[PDB]
Assembly symmetry: C2
Homo-oligomer: 211 residues x 2
C-alpha cells in the first residue's frame, strides 16, 4: 500500500527536527506540525519519539540508495562513502539527523541505543571489505573489522571537523582526502592506482542513484 | 609571590571549568556552577577571563600548552597521550572533546572554530618541521594533512565511545594514526616511528607526574 510513502514523509520531518533541535528538545507534537500528517498516521508507524529516533539513527547506512557493483570492490566502498558525503553536503535530512543523533552527547541515560545502528554501519563496511579481501584487493594481514572502523571513523572525523572549520563547504574534499589517504595503507598498489576518487564520478554516482 | 599564586588559581579555574563543560555542555554550564565547584571568588575569575566563551576556548586549547630525533614522533606522542588522558577521564581532555563535538548552540555563543584553528596550526607547524628535516613524502599539503590527523583522532574517539565506552580507545586512535602516518611519512622514517602502547604508557606516566589537581591560591578562595 502507497501510504507507506507517508511513512517516508514522517521520517524526513522527524530527521529535520532532530537535526535542528537534538533528541531531548524534539517532540512528537513538533514532528506532527512539521510533517503535517495526523496523530493516527504517526502512531500507525511509530509508537514513540524513541523508535522514531532509532529509525532516524539508521540513515547513515539505510538512507544511501544501493550502489552498483564495480570491477573493484574498493571502488564500490569509495562510491558509497562519497555518496554519503554528497547527501550530507546537500543537507539530506535523514543523513543530517542521523549525524546529530549519533554524535551529540545525550541527556545522560535517554534510553536511546546508538551502538546497534553504528554496529550495523560498520558491519556493512566489514562485508564489503570481506569481498575485497577475497578478491586479493587488500594488503595482507589486515583486520577487516579494524579497517571498517577506520573508514567510518575517518568519514565521521573529517565531516565533523569540516562542519566546525567551514560549515561543510570543504566536506567533499576532506572526506576524499581522508578516504584516499586511508586507502593508501589498505589497497594493494596495482589496485590503488585504479581507484577513482574524482568529484566527477561522485556526482554521476549521485545522479544515477537518485531514481 | 603574587604571580605564581595567580597562575595557580588560573589553573584551578580552567580544570573546574572543564569538568563542568564535560557534564553539562557549553550552554548549560554557568560561571556560577564553575565558582561553586572550584571555590574561587568571582573577582579572581573576572580577572583571569573575559567571558564564559574565552574560558571554554581556553579549555579547548589547554593541551596545546602541555627532544625527539623525529618530529613525526612528536605528533604520535601528543596524539596517543590525548587518548590515554581521555581514556582515564582526565577533566581537561574530557571537557575539550565534549566542547569540540557538541552541536552548535547556534544559536550558540561558542566560537569552536578559533581554538580548532589553533590545533590545526600546531599540527601544521610540526609538519613543516618534519618537512625541513626530510620526514615527509614529497609535495604534501601540510594543512590538509593536519586536518586529516585531527579529524582521524576525533572520528576514532567518537566511534570508540559509541561502540565501547572508550574501552578500545587507544587501539582505535593508534590504528587510525598509524594508517594516516603511513600515507604521509617517508618509509625510512615510518619504520623508525614508535606506535607501541609501551611508549605511550611511559609518556602518559611522565605526564601524570606533573598533572597535579590544581588548587586555588588561598587569597582567591570564597569565604
Amino acid at each position: 500500500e502507497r501510504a507507506a510513502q507517508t511513512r517516508r514523509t514522517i521520517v524526513a520531518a522527524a530527521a529535520a527536527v532532530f537535526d535542528e533541535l537534538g533528541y531531548e528538545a524534539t517532540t512528537i507534537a513538533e514532528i506532527l506540525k512539521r510533517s503535517g500528517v495526523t496523530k493516527g498516521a504517526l502512531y500507525f508507524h511509530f509508537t514513540s519519539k524513541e523508535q522514531l529516533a532509532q529509525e532516524v539513527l539508521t540513515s547513515q547506512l539505510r538512507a544511501v540508495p544501493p550502489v552498483e557493483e564495480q570491477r573493484l570492490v574498493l571502488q564500490q566502498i569509495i562510491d558509497e562513502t562519497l555518496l554519503l558525503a554528497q547527501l550530507l553536503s546537500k543537507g539530506d535530512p535523514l543523513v543530517r539527523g542521523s549525524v546529530r543523533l549519533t554524535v551529540e552527547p545525550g541527556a545522560p541515560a535517554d534510553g536511546l541505543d546508538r551502538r546497534a545502528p553504528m554496529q550495523e554501519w560498520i558491519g556493512h563496511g566489514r562485508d564489503l571489505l570481506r569481498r575485497a579481501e577475497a578478491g586479493g584487493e587488500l594488503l595482507p594481514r589486515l583486520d577487516v573489522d579494524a579497517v571498517a572502523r577506520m573508514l567510518v571513523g575517518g568519514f565521521t572525523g573529517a565531516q565533523i571537523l569540516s562542519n566546525i572549520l567551514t560549515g561543510h563547504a570543504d566536506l567533499l574534499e576532506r572526506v576524499t582526502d581522508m578516504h584516499r589517504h586511508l586507502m593508501t595503507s589498505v589497497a594493494v598498489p596495482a589496485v590503488l592506482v585504479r581507484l577513482d576518487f574524482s568529484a566527477e564520478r561522485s556526482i554521476t554516482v549521485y545522479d544515477e542513484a537518485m531514481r
